[PDB]
Structure 1
Amino acid sequence: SYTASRQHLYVDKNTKIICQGFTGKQGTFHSQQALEYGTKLVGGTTPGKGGQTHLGLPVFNTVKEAKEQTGATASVIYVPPPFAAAAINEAIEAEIPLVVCITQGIPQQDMVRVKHKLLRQEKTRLIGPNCPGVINPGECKIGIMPGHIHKKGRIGIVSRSGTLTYEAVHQTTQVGLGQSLCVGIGGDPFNGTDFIDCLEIFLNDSATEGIILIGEIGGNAEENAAEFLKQHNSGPNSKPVVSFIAGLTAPPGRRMGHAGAIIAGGKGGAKEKISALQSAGVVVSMSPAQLGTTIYKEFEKRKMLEH
């Protein structure tokens, strides 16, 4: 089952990465950032430029070649919307263990076709599309997140919102807790990784001592996560979970940027998600600026800070 690929989310210092769309504007800039961060970016693909050299690294026409020649176990996609679904499929077919798709704007119907293939295999784990990526601070950065705000630590972060991911990271760096692993699952309605996927990794990871879950209006993934936490994160040794759900004041019936962010037919509202998470013991920060302080205090109440 595709759930067997969940472990591939936990990138580390040994993860070698290729960049699909390597020579494009954003693929170039964020590849530069990844190299400066110390990430083992070893090459990239751009159909028609195989054999060339870019940022001092080899360029390949296909993922299959790039994987065989470089030993990469992860790929990140900076391919424009008309072709990005095909780029994801190429990475799945090449059995890349982890694929991160940054691209915003892939047709929903395209992603339905990608998900169809994705769910019928388990060599490849997809994060995204329309997401910032995944980062293991100080070990492996795959995506667009600003490197300098991270600090290796104890909080696992999963968020549908890229920018709110950065807020959670910054706040948990500020209060000294740091981050174990940070996954932006993106704002699209059809994607490769949901809250439960990341929550499984977090609850089983000893380095993750607390969790921040950031959601928003639309869908029912937060409600599913609430039930998952009810059954797997109750009792004595539970890990504190803090959450913020964006859109409490959003107008109904409007797509709020993310196509996945809409209140339609009375479903997808923020208050229902907040209540579901609260019923599971999650502490919901009403302010998005207080995620760090809220989880710090939950660590304090449980005497989890060794001052």
Structure 2
Amino acid sequence: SYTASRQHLYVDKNTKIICQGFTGKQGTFHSQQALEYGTKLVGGTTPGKGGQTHLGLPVFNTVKEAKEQTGATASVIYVPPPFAAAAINEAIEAEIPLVVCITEGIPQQDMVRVKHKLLRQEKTRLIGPNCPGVINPGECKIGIMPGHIHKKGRIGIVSRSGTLTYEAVHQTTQVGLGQSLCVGIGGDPFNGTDFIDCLEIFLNDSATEGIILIGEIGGNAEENAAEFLKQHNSGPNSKPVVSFIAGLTAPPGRRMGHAGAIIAGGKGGAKEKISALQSAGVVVSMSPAQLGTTIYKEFEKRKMLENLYFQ
């Protein structure tokens, strides 16, 4: 099933990337930045421009050609909303192991169609759309997150918000813990990777020693992940999980920027998510500024408990 592609989320120094929308405005700028950052970007696609060279790299008409000629195992999509779903579909058809879609504004009906194809295969893992991307600090960066804030370390971060990811990265770098792998699953209601997907990778990753889960109003993915953590991250050797849920002050029945961020039919409130996570044993930072300090304190408490009772 599609769950078999979860491991593709864990990009590393060996991941080779192509850019879909290579010659566009953001495709060009962020491809330049990836090259200047040392990430193994090896080419890209723009239909009708196959054969050109861009940033010293080959341009192809199709993902299939790009993959065959470069050995790329990941693609990043900077394609505008009207055509970005067909761009995801092309990368799925080409069996690209990881597809990261940055694009904001893809129609939900388009993504429902994309999801139908995605769930019926297992070669391709989709992150997004409307997401900042994924980073394994010092090994591989795919997306738009800012520079000079990450530090390779011990904390796995999964977030429905890109800007909140930057905050949590900055905070965990500043308290000296760093990040093992950071996945922004984006703010759209129909996407390729949920919280539980990332938690499974985090819980089974020896380099990840704690987890930050960043959520917000709308849907029930935080509730589902909480029950998942209650059942499967509650024994000995469990890993500390800290969470922040945006939208405590959001008015009901309004989309708070994100298509997915809405309290509808009395469902989706932040309080109910905080309470589910807490009752699952997740430590919830009430403040978005205190994610670094909260998980640092949780590590120190685990240290003391392990030395007190589990020598």
TM class by shorter chain equals over 0.9
TM-superposed CA distance for 1:283, in Å, is 0.3
Matches within 5 A, 1:249-260: 249-260=249-260
Q: Over residues 105-145 of structure 1, what are the superposed CA-to-partner deviations in whole Å (9 max), with x where a residue is unaligned?
A: 00000000000000000000000000000000000000001
Q: What is residue 31 of structure 1 aligned with on the other side? A: 31
Moved over 3 A (4+): 304-307
Deviations 1:213-269 (A, max 9, x none): 000000000000001101110012110000000000111110000010000110000
Alignment RMSD: 1.5
CA distance in 1, matches of 2:259, 2:276: 23
Q: Which runs of 5+ in 2 are unaligned?
A: none
Q: After TM superposition, give the deviation of residue 37 of structure 1 in Å.
A: 1.4
In structure 1, the residue matched to 2:174 is: 174
TM-score with structure 2 setting the length: 0.97
Task: Give, in whole Å, the separation in 2 of the partners of 1:167 and 1:239.
Answer: 21
Q: CA deviation at 1:304?
A: 7.8
Cα deviation per residue 1:72-114 (whole Å; 9 max; x = unaligned)? 0000000000000000000000000000000000000000000
In the aligned structure 2, how far is the partner of 1:92 from the partner of 1:217?
Answer: 30
Q: Distance in 2 between matches of 1:184 and 1:27?
A: 18
1:140–1:305: structure 2 CA closer, same or farther, 3 Å change rule?
farther
How far 1:147 moved relative to its partner?
2.5
Instruction: After TM superposition, give the deviation of residue 211 of structure 1 in Å.
Output: 0.1
Structure-2 separation of matches of 1:210 and 1:34: 28
Other-structure match for 1:12: 12
TM alignment of 1:206-285, pairs within 5 A: 206-285=206-285
CA distance in 2, matches of 1:97, 1:178: 27
- Once the two structures are overlaid, the 10-residue window that deviates more, 139-148 or 182-191, is 139-148
Distance 1:158 1:104 in 2: 19
Give the percent of matched residue pairs that are identical in Structure 1 and Structure 2.
99
Structure 1 contact 188–258 (Cα < 8 Å) conserved: yes
- Shift in CA distance, 156/304, structure 1 to aligned 2, threshold 3 Å: farther
Rounded Cα–Cα distance in structure 1 between residues aligned with 2:148 and 2:121: 36
- CA distance in 1 between counterparts of 2:304 and 2:122 reads 37
**Deviation (angstroms), 1:32:** 1.1
Offset of 1:29 from its aligned partner?
A: 0.7
CA contact 1:129–1:188 (8 Å) conserved in 2: yes
Q: Secondary structure at the match of 1:149?
A: coil
Give runs of aligned pairs for residues 33-112 of structure 1, distance below 5 A. 33-112=33-112
What's the CA shift for 1:305?
12
Q: Say if 1:305 and 1:231 are closer, same or farther in 2 by CA, change over 3 A.
A: closer
